[PDB]
Amino acid sequence: SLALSLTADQMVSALLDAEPPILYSEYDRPFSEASMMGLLTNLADRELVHMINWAKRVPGFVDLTLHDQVHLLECAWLEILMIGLVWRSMEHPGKLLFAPNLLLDRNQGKCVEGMVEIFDMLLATSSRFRMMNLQGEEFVCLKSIILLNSGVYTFLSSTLKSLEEKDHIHRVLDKITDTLIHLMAKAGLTLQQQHQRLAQLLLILSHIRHMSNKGMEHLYSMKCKNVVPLSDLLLEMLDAHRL
Amino acid sequence: LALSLTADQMVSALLDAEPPILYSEYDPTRPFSEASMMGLLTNLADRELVHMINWAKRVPGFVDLTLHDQVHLLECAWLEILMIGLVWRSMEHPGKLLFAPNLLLDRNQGKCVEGMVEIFDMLLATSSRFRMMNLQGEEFVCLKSIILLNSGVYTFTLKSLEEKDHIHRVLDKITDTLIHLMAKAGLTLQQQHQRLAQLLLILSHIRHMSNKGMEHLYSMKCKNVVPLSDLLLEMLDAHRLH
Amino acid sequence: KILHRLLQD
Amino acid sequence: KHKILHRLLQD
Numbered sequence: 001s002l003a004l005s006l007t008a009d010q011m012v013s014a015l016l017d018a019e020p021p022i023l024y025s026e027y028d029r030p031f032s033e034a035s036m037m038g039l040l041t042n043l044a045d046r047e048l049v050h051m052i053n054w055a056k057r058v059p060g061f062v063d064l065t066l067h068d069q070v071h072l073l074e075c076a077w078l079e080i081l082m083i084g085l086v087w088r089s090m091e092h093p094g095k096l097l098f099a100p101n102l103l104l105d106r107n108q109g110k111c112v113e114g115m116v117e118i119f120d121m122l123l124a125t126s127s128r129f130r131m132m133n134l135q136g137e138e139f140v141c142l143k144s145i146i147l148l149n150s151g152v153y154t155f156l157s158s159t160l161k162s163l164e165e166k167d168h169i170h171r172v173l174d175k176i177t178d179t180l181i182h183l184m185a186k187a188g189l190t191l192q193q194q195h196q197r198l199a200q201l202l203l204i205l206s207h208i209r210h211m212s213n214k215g216m217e218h219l220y221s222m223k224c225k226n227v228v229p230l231s232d233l234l235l236e237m238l239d240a241h242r243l
Numbered sequence: 244l245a246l247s248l249t250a251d252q253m254v255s256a257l258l259d260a261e262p263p264i265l266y267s268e269y270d271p272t273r274p275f276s277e278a279s280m281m282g283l284l285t286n287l288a289d290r291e292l293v294h295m296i297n298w299a300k301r302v303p304g305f306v307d308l309t310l311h312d313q314v315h316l317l318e319c320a321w322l323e324i325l326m327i328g329l330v331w332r333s334m335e336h337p338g339k340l341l342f343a344p345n346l347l348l349d350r351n352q353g354k355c356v357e358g359m360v361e362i363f364d365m366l367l368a369t370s371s372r373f374r375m376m377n378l379q380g381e382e383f384v385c386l387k388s389i390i391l392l393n394s395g396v397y398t399f400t401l402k403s404l405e406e407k408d409h410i411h412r413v414l415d416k417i418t419d420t421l422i423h424l425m426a427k428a429g430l431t432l433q434q435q436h437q438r439l440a441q442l443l444l445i446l447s448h449i450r451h452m453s454n455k456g457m458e459h460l461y462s463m464k465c466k467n468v469v470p471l472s473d474l475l476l477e478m479l480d481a482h483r484l485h
Numbered sequence: 486k487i488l489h490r491l492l493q494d
Numbered sequence: 495k496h497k498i499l500h501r502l503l504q505d
């Protein structure tokens with residue numbers, strides 16, 4: 001209910017202090033593929049735990065059934081991890097700031113087979129964000145749009161209870177749109193400019209989706225190769241995409 | 244030059260470039276198998292590809308780009324472009340996919356092909372969404388051109404970076420065209436940005452479908468289920484899946 | 486079922 | 495490498 005009643009400034013505020021903290025890696029010296037992929041997945045794992053708590057704070061998100069919130073994180077999780085990574089790396093051209101103590105540059109992504117291509121994409125996105133001078137308040141909104149948008153079409157049930165579920169997610173997503181526009185109006189953007197930037201921002205979410213799909217395959221190919229012992233929760237998030 | 248065109252100029256341009264709707268080789272004197280099923284759809288895709296290449300060349304600003312960039316964009320976007328065409332045509336047949344006027348499949352027909360029912364289901368979902376948004380012909384053509392110019396753009400010394408500016412400028416027009424269409428239809432200004440976001444958020448979902456269908460096709464190929472035209476083969480080898 | 490559980494806590 | 499996409503984008 002109260003999610004829809006929110007003002008533009010209260011949505012921004014809700015989102016800005018639901019923001020999870022930045023986590024730390026672990027401390028070295030030479031990097032094997034095993035040690036490397038072990039540091040990145042240990043990290044992803046801890047970050048998922050905090051994300052589950054961030055999702056719950058995201059307005060309207062807990063209004064959804066257990067099963068639908070489940071499904072939405074199942075679809076959204078690596079994208080969410082990725083946009084946070086690209087966001088944290090804005091201010092560092094050429095490097096991916098996974099953690100304050102784990103800042104890796106392209107050459108270092110050749111330590112792990114297959115992840116250099118994905119590295120480049122993550123770099124490109126960060127560079128694009130930088131190019132647009134993306135703002136923290138647009139970032140938190142982008143990130144909610146992903147949580148709510150990414151699983152919403154893969155709700156296939158044709159029950160009464162499930163249609164108004166989609167419409168609710170569709171109404172929340174409209175507020176978050178209203179807010180993004182509110183942010184750009186504030187920045188003193190013209191109307192044409194506002195529609196152009198909104199457009200630009202959401203087209204980037206298409207690239208983040210592709211990135212997620214690729215990183216998901218990559219992560220499945222390491223699971224097989226028995227390189228990294230992945231956590232149980234990461235295993236079960238990963239197992240959600242061959243279902 | 245694509246950048247000086249008005250919105251009604253832009254929309255006509257895209258409306259007259261539209262490709263034809265093609266017919267499948269369908270042989271109803273033949274039963275169905277994973278193999279005949281897949282032969283029919285990959286034949287169709289292959290022919291639909293040739294037209295696409297030509298449709299693309301009539302996309303304002305597209306011939307401006309270098310051939311390497313054009314090859315690259317098409318390499319990235321071809322299956323989304325086929326998928327959004329499909330979902331568009333199926334709009335008015337709920338629960339079926341109109342691959343071709345003589346090839347209209349429901350999901351139980353999906354069963355034939357290992358791995359397809361997942362993808363089919365997505366494709367129907369999106370069709371439904373289009374139908375529920377009452378998506379318009381004019382909006383479709385723009386959405387399609389947005390997919391061609393965007394999907395490859397992030398994966399690009401000096402001319403390299405001035406082709407980026409250029410795609411972005413053309414994409415800024417199609418957004419203008421989108422809104423102006425929505426203004427012309429009498430949507431409020433708040434409804435303009437809300438609808439605009441919704442059609443764009445669907446592109447994210449179409450990309451997910453292309454990525455899955457690409458993997459799906461690749462299984463088919465690696466399992467020797469259906470022979471693939473060298474063109475489809477090249478398109479597929481573009482995305483180095485494994 | 487871990488995700489499930491984590492959403493309840 | 496003479497790619498077919500390449501070629502058709504010339505016809």
Ligand SMILES: Oc1ccc(-c2n[nH]c3cc(O)ccc23)c(O)c1
Nearest residue numbers: 040041044081082085118215218219
């Ligand atoms: O192919 C991939 C994609 C992502 C990760 C990854 N691992 N750890 C991460 C932490 C983040 O905040 C974001 C992404 C990651 C990875 O280890 C491999």
Ligand SMILES: Oc1ccc(-c2n[nH]c3cc(O)ccc23)c(O)c1
Nearest residue numbers: 284285288325326329362456459460
């Ligand atoms: O997993 C997939 C996804 C799409 C196709 C496909 N095959 N042929 C098509 C023709 C269209 O107009 C649109 C989609 C297709 C396919 O053969 C397999």
